């Protein structure tokens, strides 16, 4: 149908918006602490601590599979990256501190992307 295509044009443009957002969030992690999943060879107990791991490459695979239906689902995944880190790592660590910074810097980008998605449907 013609409706299914127009929806697909929107999903595709939402995917195009979220990719820009994702690159902007990732530029706020220049140390690349959050680029890749936490290694289970190196942190073998990780899954006993963290039930839903998340990272920027895993967000990218889902993004390019047009697997984010809306901004909320995308934001949930971003928040996981931060929240997982802040639980697993103590306050006085480079890792915990890198998440606090990513969160604070991300907030601005996510504020404007909420307005852009509402604004352009």
Curated annotation (Swiss-Prot):
Annotated tissue distribution: Highly expressed in testis.
Cross-link (Glycyl lysine isopeptide (Lys-Gly) (interchain with G-Cter in SUMO2)): 41
UniProt-annotated location(s): Nucleus; Chromosome
Bromo domain span: 9-113
Assembly, per entry: Component of some HBO1 complex composed of KAT7/HBO1, MEAF6, ING4 and BRD1/BRPF2. Component of the MOZ/MORF complex composed at least of ING5, KAT6A, KAT6B, MEAF6 and one of BRPF1, BRD1/BRPF2 and BRPF3. Interacts (via PHD-type zinc finger domain) with unmodified histone H3. Interacts (via PWWP domain) with dimethylated and trimethylated 'Lys-79' on histone H3.
Protein task: Scaffold subunit of various histone acetyltransferase (HAT) complexes, such as the MOZ/MORF and HBO1 complexes, that acts as a regulator of hematopoiesis. Plays a key role in HBO1 complex by directing KAT7/HBO1 specificity towards histone H3 'Lys-14' acetylation (H3K14ac), thereby promoting erythroid differentiation.
The protein, known as: Bromodomain-containing protein 1
Organism whose genome encodes this protein: Homo sapiens
Higher taxonomy: Eukaryota, Metazoa, Chordata, Craniata, Vertebrata
